[model samples]
Target: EPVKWECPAGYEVKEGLNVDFPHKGMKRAFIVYPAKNVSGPAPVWVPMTGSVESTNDNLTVARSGANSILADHGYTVIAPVRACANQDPNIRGERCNGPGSNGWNWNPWFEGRAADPSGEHWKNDEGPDSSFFVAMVQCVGTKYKLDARRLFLGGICSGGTMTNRALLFRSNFWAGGLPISGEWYVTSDDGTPLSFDDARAAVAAAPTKIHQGRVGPYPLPAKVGPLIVMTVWGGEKDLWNCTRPDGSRFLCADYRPSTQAGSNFFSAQPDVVHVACSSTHGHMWPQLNTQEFNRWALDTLASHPKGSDPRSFKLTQPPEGYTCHVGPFTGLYASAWS
Candidate 1:
């Protein structure tokens, strides 16, 4: 029997969309959740998944009710599964801005160690993922009618960091984003932003593993689309705890610094809109009342489109459970609700 994919009454789920991905030397898969009954072009939400057991399971287990809200409310959402495999039980391969191959060995390094170790957010080492994205966009564009002005991108954790890169390198493409728990790749001890040389030294000397602090949030291009982003932090205990390969002590990662760095980077650019939201929920998406938060977040993102008046634009209402505010985050942390 042919497999059936389901969504809310107003939306349609297109699964098993096989496309040629030259980077991995094989075809890759993606799922598109599009709004139903759209006579005109509909908004597009390009979501990426974190580095987890499987990108499929990341939706069902890690994100659950959250990833679907944008589609439920009328925007079209699309996501792709990683193309390679890693030996670790926790990793599935990725097609984004991360370590390319898993080496299929006990390679201590995770996707954080990229071929481009310069810590430059302005440029990537390679366009391995860009090739795939180009094909994916063309595939979706030809098959469906989409609103280029309202095109948005985002995801959770590694997925969020992927959005971080997406918003930068491809700055003009996305109208907005909801990068939850995204890493800024800061190598600093106090969460202060890093200089290029500072990050280079830190990332070069750092131990291998996705559980780490590294480079990023350096600078933005001279011109970017009128993009408004809500960079979320999982708060106080929002961290990744890992034991050494030798099964020794624990290596804990608190990503608040990364969020702070990311928020600060965006705040500096007067043309960009940055909303900072922090929660004690720790290293996860806003789980409390997840549907409402996404519904509000997605609606806010979709309305702004690609050419909002940033000079006159200001975010008033925040998500249902989050105390989000416009501008760079202050202090080391803040609670979920104001």
Candidate 2:
């Protein structure tokens, strides 16, 4: 059965306000929570929209209904207005200064992009300028007394890529990560492609699946722990492809191989409940069998509430009499078998 949702008692959707607790910003981050009665720190969901040409205005196309769904389920929702500069000079800010820096959309790399004078926060390889994001979550948790252990991350497109990085670096901060329609590779400042060794080295640096680290009050675990990463891509249309000068086709965007690379890394650790889903849609969030994604995430968390334990981690077979479509270039496959 599909998961049902209802707002918690005394809580309602709060709209038209910018977050103003820890730090003050100009962007309006729509939030939903209890009206008056405190709920003693509940789980919070932060959903970010995809890249748009405008910085002040978020295009409707970037949204994937995550905010509403989380709110309906009685979870506090903080929808941040990402600063963007898709259009130059007139729009202001740095160009593509989000997720993977300037190298996200057009180029592919092994780590974050390098430094550029795009007039933005956090340069490539310098690490994601997640201060605003982290502060916002901390402030919201402080105001609402939310549980730090219940924090989770979810996003689409560029937002999804950022989510992956967040999980990669700040695994201790977030309990689980749902990066939809995004890959976890970095590119050079000049958009230079990464070699297989570079990618492997980047993924291999982490001893336990993804890196195990801590930020703020969250202390690093005694040993590297398994992370819960849910990665989804498409089979039929969405993998990035372009025509080479010789007129031959080559995959350009970081969709197929990159996702596979991430999945392969996460799968190495049995504690990491990494489930990669593939469908027919191209360059867009999954609309077909939409609930299936959430169902898998929710079920996985339910089964491993406190996160997976590597000592007891084991690969669960897909299902009986099921087949998976492994992509051509990369071994990444799409499976209907949950």
Candidate 3:
């Protein structure tokens, strides 16, 4: 028998937001409910998966345990299945295309929503299309009566990059973002710096504000508000900082310098939180220490309300023996990444 990841005493884990996509066909998010569900809207946490192909249901996430953890604690979990192609030869699935998989991440699907007119990047269109990415979240919110304001997002690897992109372009919709194993800098699949121009263009074309008053494919907004961002990166062995095209240096693996630069573009505010490991952990999520890093990211996000920007934040130091570190976020918890 396939072991059921049972929920809490009275909680339940059910399937189907029953949503469809342009290219991915029929898809839905798995929803977990609390025992004594609230009468009004409730907070929602969305965990984006890495690049997964159709055979794997087109959804891939780092920590499957998160579903039970989030549900048992009383928050609704919305795990969406992004239409991605698995290019790995070893992994065979319905959607796995092997070697030459386009592996465009979530850009192509999202880019189709609106046109940029200036004809710069892919499809001559930029994006802030919550309708494209946040579609599942919205579907679940409407069906389950979720507190849209308290919406939180977290992801691993490609999912983390998706979260990071959403934070920059779709900032207005989310309250907080937890990007594990990824950051604002542009990088290839193997974690090499690609082009700052690509990164800059994405943000430059994003909306100036949230999507409260939009009516049909709006060109773009003037600016977007700051989202309370909690970011996680592996140790030095994981993805680290790289020199820009200009050869300017910036902190990567640790939270030593360029903290503001990292924040300005992504967090858009000084009140940013970072979680990292000390000893090199290579290119993977910090699965050691009982997933303390993962729990910290979730908890930190839960503590803050929507539309909040703390002027002065405290650091969430790593546990003893772990070189993991945190800053501007006065809290303590476990961690991990892609």
Candidate 4:
């Protein structure tokens, strides 16, 4: 029998959108609702699961994995299969970025690569994908009656890596971010691609994940200032990597001495909890390990509600000028975003 990742009986696919973007054209978006449903303004979660480059079966599982769990918990889930950069539908370019109007046919399997990771091509969008996704959620909210205050997002590996990018650029729209096995840096900055050492340093100093404490109320409404930011890290996967010139393969080589890779971003930001797991595998969701990821994701967001004032939530003071850790085989810890 072929292995298929199906949603449990509790969740159902509610609607799907053939989303058209002004910049990128069309792609698929799925709206899934929990089975043991609740009434009025349920929280909405957007998961970026479908990648053009990833294999089909894997993409399906990624898109639907959290739907069942989140649905069972009474939250709505939205999964978007973004346009792939890959020219090939079966492999390589499919998960990469693409043109706005092309379906799978016009999709770039590997025709062109993003000029560099920093350029508009490499990124999901100009300013983190969260803005584009939030607009989609707002559309979903209008259609399904979502609780705007509780909007959330979670991503895995490449998806997760992009999620972190979105977090750095679009922290305004989300209550929290579950960056699962995320990659911290991209190849390009200016016209030239960055070196591995520079890439490591890029994330080391990058403000990809924002800490709540440093954010001021003036830019966004005071209502949005108190928004929660949570980061989840995996020990076994997506460790910080630098590319090695391995003969025919320009593959990743370990840069840091530690097992932790993308997880270190949150450590420097004391306001954000760094949830590191020593027992997971490379770039996959922590489903088999336990439902801890789901529980942590939901519970973290559940800590704050949209209607509640930020002043009302309990917060702790962080140590002055904390320089967060960069690691190897470290245990996990949680703390309020400073």
Best by lDDT: 1
Arrange candidates by TM-score, highest first: which order?
A: 1, 2, 4, 3
Q: What's the C-alpha lDDT at position 196 in model 3? A: 39
The list of candidate 1 runs beyond 4 A from truth reads: 1-16, 19-26, 61-66, 85-126, 187-223, 247-249, 314-316, 333-338
lDDT of each candidate versus the true structure:
0.57, 0.46, 0.43, 0.42
Alpha-carbon deviation at 8 in model 1, angstroms: 30
Model 3: per-residue lDDT, tens digit, 204-293? Answer: 333221111011112222345545676554444554443445767553332211122233344334433334333344434445552465
Q: Native-vs-model 1 lDDT?
A: 0.57
For model 2, the run of ten residues with the poorest summed lDDT: 212-221
Segments of candidate 4 deviating more than 4 angstroms:
1-28, 50-66, 85-128, 186-193, 201-225, 236-250, 253-279, 290-292, 306-338
Winner of 1 and 3 under lDDT: 1
List ranges where model 3 is wrong by over 4 Å: 1-40, 52-65, 85-119, 122-130, 183-223, 239-264, 267-280, 312-338
lDDT of 1 by residue, 187-263 (tens): 45533445434543453343221112332222234555568887888777767654445656453345666677667
Global lDDT of model 2: 0.46
lDDT tens string, model 4, 1-338? 11122332333325543233332343334434432467987776666542333433232444324444666677776655444522122344332533222211113221112323323343323232444465556555544667666777766544554555555555555655655554443333332434446545543454343222101111112222224444444443435332223524343422221213344444444333343333344434554423444654565566676435434444332223111222222443222243
Candidate 3: lDDT of 275? 41
lDDT of 2 by residue, 10-56 (tens): 33324434433232333323343432333565666666554432222
